[PDB]
């Protein structure tokens, strides 16, 4: 039972249980059913809350369909993984991640006038190794001026702070001039394209290093989990996993009437069907109706 | 794929590269007389110029049937490829069963023989736990929720430190 | 029975999606 705002998110979605709900909804609209009125109310706080809790319903079936490139050599499966995350973010309603984190920056420090409270209100959304390297530059400009350097653009203190911050940015490894000349725009399409290609080269290396860092975290977690598991004798492993499986079954079995409980138990029935169907003919895979 | 593709009978592969399957076409004006041989079965048919264009009309859309999910199966495949790297060094364990005879029992120190039998039981423990392969599907669900809540971001699923740092330069170094 | 479907078998199984649906159903009327 789709609620006319959930189905508007699943129209461009490409996973299974959302598209099946859309197909049932569109076959309902084929059999002479009216579409509900889309509600033009619920001022912007509830709007962004519904967007936040509705793009998660498109992201969460979409992450579990995206295979990690674990243990792979090369930047081609890492780029496959980051591209699938990009297509998932675009299906769920997000924009480019550059644009979305710039929007988070502009939404965070819209009412801050000093650079120090910009660095203290965008603290979570930047790395600590970069926030410290900006805080020391800000402290040096505070030693040079002995007055709070304001975040205006026409204030000259911000200019002599940014002239060091560009050197900080290029010494971190990211070309600040290429990024600024992309996101400012250019005169003709040739000198705009000449910096668009270089910003997309940096951006490709940026999200590829991001996905590679995520995959190295999952690889280290899998190695630590296995090396802690291979130190146990087998009976301890079997009783621990039967205890975990039974306790997480009964955590869904006590709660009854909800959608996630029946979906969990229908999924356990589907997993047991998969084990039976691979038992019936194991050299040909599971039986799919075709 | 897109809705309009433009491939077929034009800069196409006309001959095979493998000795296991032997394909050959007849590049005529419009049509093509193919002949394909894969072992003792043979097929030699004819495809029209407007017959490969309608091949990409219906889309295949290959999608995977997994036991739990493609994420969980990829994590479990990695855990199995780690179990193999442990198992390959349990494969190089020196054969202690050649020294079980009583001409090594009564020649050796009592404490060194107790140490040796403890080492053999330790090998049997390591080998019986590295080949508990059905526990990998439960270990792989101890990586799934932390990762899947990492991708449940308020910003973007594909976000990371480098993109946010580059856009923090773009936010800071532009005016206000 | 056996040979279920393909679009029924493309579902990622133990994904959340419904704890999210439960919170979005018990939060949005109560925050409105």
């Amino acid at each position: 039972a789709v609620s006319k705002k959930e189905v508007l998110y699943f129209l461009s979605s490409k996973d299974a249980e959302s598209s099946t709900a859309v197909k049932s909804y569109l076959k309902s609209l084929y059999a002479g059913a009216q579409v509900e009125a889309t509600e033009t109310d619920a001022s912007e706080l509830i709007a962004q809350l519904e967007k936040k809790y509705l793009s998660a319903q498109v992201v969460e079936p979409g992450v579990h369909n995206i295979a990690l490139p674990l243990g792979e050599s090369g930047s081609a499966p890492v780029k496959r993984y980051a591209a699938e995350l990009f297509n998932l973010g675009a299906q769920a309603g997000f924009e480019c991640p550059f644009i979305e984190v710039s929007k988070k920056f502009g939404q965070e420090t819209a009412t801050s006038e000093t650079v120090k409270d910009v660095l203290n209100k965008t603290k979570s959304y930047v790395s600590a190794d970069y926030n410290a390297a900006l805080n020391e530059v800000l402290s040096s400009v505070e030693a040079e001026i002995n007055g709070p350097v304001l975040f205006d653009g026409k204030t000259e203190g911000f200019k002599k702070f940014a002239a060091k911050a560009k050197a900080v940015a290029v010494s971190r490894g990211l070309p600040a001039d290429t990024i600024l000349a992309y996101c400012a725009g250019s005169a003709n399409e040739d000198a705009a394209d000449k910096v668009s290609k270089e910003f997309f080269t940096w951006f490709e290396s940026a999200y590829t290093a991001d996905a590679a860092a995520e995959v190295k975290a999952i690889e280290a977690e899998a190695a630590s989990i296995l090396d802690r598991h291979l130190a146990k004798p087998v009976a301890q492993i079997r009783k621990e996993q039967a205890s975990a499986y039974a306790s997480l079954l009964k955590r869904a079995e006590t709660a009854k009437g909800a959608k996630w409980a029946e979906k969990y138990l229908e999924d356990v029935k589907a997993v047991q069907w998969f084990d039976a169907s691979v038992a019936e003919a194991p050299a040909s895979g599971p039986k799919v109706a075709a | 794929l897109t809705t309009f593709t433009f491939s077929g009978l034009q800069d196409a592969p006309v001959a095979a590269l493998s000795g296991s399957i032997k394909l050959n076409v007849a590049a005529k004006a419009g049509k093509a007389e193919v002949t394909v041989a894969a072992g003792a079965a043979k097929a030699a048919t004819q495809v029209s110029a407007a017959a490969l264009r309608k091949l990409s009309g219906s889309k295949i859309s290959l999608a995977e049937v997994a036991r739990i999910s493609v994420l969980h199966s990829s994590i479990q495949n990695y855990l199995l490829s780690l179990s193999n790297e442990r198992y390959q060094l349990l494969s190089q364990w020196p054969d202690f069963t050649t020294m079980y005879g009583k001409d090594f029992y009564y020649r050796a120190h009592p404490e060194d023989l107790k140490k040796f039998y403890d080492a053999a039981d330790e090998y049997y423990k390591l080998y019986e736990t590295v080949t508990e392969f059905d526990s990998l599907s439960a270990l792989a669900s101890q990586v799934v929720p932390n990762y899947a809540a990492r991708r449940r971001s308020t910003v973007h699923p594909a976000i990371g430190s480098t993109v946010a740092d580059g856009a923090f330069t773009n936010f800071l170094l532009s005016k206000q | 029975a056996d040979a279920k479907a393909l679009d029924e078998l493309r579902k990622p199984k133990f994904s959340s999606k419904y704890l999210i649906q439960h919170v979005s159903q018990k939060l949005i009327p109560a925050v409105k």
Binding site: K52, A56, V101, S124, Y125, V126, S127, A213, E214, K216, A217, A220, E221, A223, S224, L226, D227, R228, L230, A231, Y245, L248, L249, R251, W260, Y264, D267, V268, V271 | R67, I68, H72, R86, L89, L90, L126, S137, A138, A140, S141, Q142, V144, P145, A148, A149, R150, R152, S153, T154, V155, I159, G160, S161, A164 | F14, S16, L19, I20, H22, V23
Partner: peptide, 30 residues
């Protein structure tokens, strides 16, 4: 094989905390 369902969001953007290498290869070679 089944996992605890979590419903929480990650607001901060951190480096993903690459964990330490365990000693299992060294201990089994020993």
């Amino acid at each position: 094989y089944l996992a605890p369902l979590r419903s929480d969001f990650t607001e901060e953007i951190t480096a993903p905390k690459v964990a330490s290498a365990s000693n299992l290869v060294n201990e089994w070679n020993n």
